[PDB]
Amino acid sequence: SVAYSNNSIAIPTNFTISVTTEILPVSMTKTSVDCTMYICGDSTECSNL
Amino acid sequence: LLQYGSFCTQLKRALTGIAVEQDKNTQEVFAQVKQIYKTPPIKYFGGFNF
Amino acid sequence: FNGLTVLPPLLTDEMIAQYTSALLAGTITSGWTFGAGPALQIPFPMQMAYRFNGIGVTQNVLYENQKLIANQFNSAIGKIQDSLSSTPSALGKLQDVV
Amino acid sequence: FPQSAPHGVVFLHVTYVPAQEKNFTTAPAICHDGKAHFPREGVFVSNGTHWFVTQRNFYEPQIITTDNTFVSGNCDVVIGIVNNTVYD
Ligand SMILES: *[C@@H]1O[C@H](CO)[C@@H](O[C@@H]2O[C@H](CO)[C@@H](O)[C@H](O)[C@H]2NC(C)=O)[C@H](O)[C@H]1NC(C)=O
Ligand SMILES: *[C@@H]1O[C@H](CO)[C@@H](O[C@@H]2O[C@H](CO)[C@@H](O)[C@H](O)[C@H]2NC(C)=O)[C@H](O)[C@H]1NC(C)=O
Ligand SMILES: *[C@@H]1O[C@H](CO)[C@@H](O)[C@H](O)[C@H]1NC(C)=O
Ligand SMILES: *[C@@H]1O[C@H](CO)[C@@H](O)[C@H](O)[C@H]1NC(C)=O
Ligand SMILES: *[C@@H]1O[C@H](CO)[C@@H](O)[C@H](O)[C@H]1NC(C)=O
Ligand SMILES: *[C@@H]1O[C@H](CO)[C@@H](O)[C@H](O)[C@H]1NC(C)=O
């Protein structure tokens, strides 16, 4: 609870230098997928369907 | 149903992530200060009525 | 309900109200100092003079028209409750989520 | 200052924080010769018996002079005015 009153003030007389850190993601992994090899494998008949 | 795969684990994980994010949103918006300040007993601020 | 449940939020409404009250007390009694470190006292008219001085208007403008500014602020605050009550869709954004 | 991390960035922020505050008594304006004086930049302050003017973020008292004040008014309108001498 701060001591409020209509004729009083507070003023700092010293300082401090502080250093903080912030971490941020930017990019993720790049992938690629080939349909037929994943789904149908080497089955020749599967690709026709 | 056990023959269809592991869709249920994914569903549960997604819902849990949404819920945790919902809590974090309110925490980030409102929990700014570290002290619980209290207003003085006498409410006279130079004519302004709060 | 068939396997569907609703979980309660972590913070109750009373806790949110306490946060809001803390923010209001800090801004009324200190100004912008409590957001950057320890809170420092200052009389409210002096804070308002500081805030006028931050938009290009000198302090004597505030100090010589204190009562008029206070009356205008009081009327403006008073009108808000009626404005919120009258307009039906003033709170549509919050209702859409539900 | 920036730094690089796998798939992301890190920022080192250098900031200034006040400390070691103290009580003081203040007034909005100073009456003298039937004229009101306001601070050009700073706030009036009192150490118990004398009045100074100081910048608002670091305690550094100064003698009140017409250099760092402007008159712009009269002594009979401001609420809470305190009358004292102003040097030259
Ligand atoms: C302002 O704060 C600084 C930091 O606390 C004070 O520096 C210290 O002063 C004491 C006494 O002279 C020394 O024993 C410490 O070693 C100092 N700290 C450092 C990091 O050097 C400084 O004295 C304070 N100034 C005033 C006017 O209070
Ligand atoms: C601040 O404003 C409130 C709201 O108008 C004032 O409360 C009113 O006071 C009058 C007379 O005391 C009553 O007739 C009203 O019914 C009150 N309104 C409400 C909503 O309760 C209050 O008096 C004002 N404060 C000061 C110090 O004047
Ligand atoms: C405001 O100043 C007057 C002096 O004129 C004093 O009586 C009153 O107590 C002050 N307000 C508060 C909240 O202390
Ligand atoms: C300023 O005055 C109040 C009122 O007594 C007091 O509680 C507070 O400690 C004072 N500030 C400092 C830095 O001593
Ligand atoms: C206030 O300042 C004057 C002028 O420097 C000085 O003579 C007086 O002792 C000071 N009072 C206190 C309580 O420090
Ligand atoms: C100086 O201030 C005191 C107290 O406010 C007041 O009694 C006195 O009349 C003022 N001086 C003049 C010349 O009016």
UniProtKB/Swiss-Prot annotation, chain A:
Source species: Severe acute respiratory syndrome coronavirus 2 (2019-nCoV)
Q: Does the entry annotate any disulfide bonds, and if so which pairs?
A: C40-C46
Which start and end residues of the full protein are shown?
A: 704 to 752 of 1273
The record describes the protein's role as: Precursor of the fusion protein processed in the biosynthesis of the S protein and the formation of virus particle. Mediates fusion of the virion and cellular membranes by functioning as a class I viral fusion protein. Contains two viral fusion peptides that are unmasked after cleavage. The S2/S2' cleavage occurs during virus entry at the cell membrane by host TMPRSS2 or during endocytosis by host CSTL.
User: So which residues have sugars stuck on them?
Assistant: N6, N14
| Protein's name in the database | Spike protein S2
Q: Which domain of life is it from?
A: Viruses
Gene (UniProt): S
Swiss-Prot record, chain B:
Q: Which residues are glycosylated?
A: N49
* Entry superkingdom: Viruses
Function per UniProt: Precursor of the fusion protein processed in the biosynthesis of the S protein and the formation of virus particle. Mediates fusion of the virion and cellular membranes by functioning as a class I viral fusion protein. Contains two viral fusion peptides that are unmasked after cleavage. The S2/S2' cleavage occurs during virus entry at the cell membrane by host TMPRSS2 or during endocytosis by host CSTL.
What name does UniProt use for this protein?
Answer: Spike protein S2
Q: What organism is this sequence from?
A: Severe acute respiratory syndrome coronavirus 2
Q: Which gene encodes it?
A: S
The shown residues of the full protein are 753 to 802 of 1273
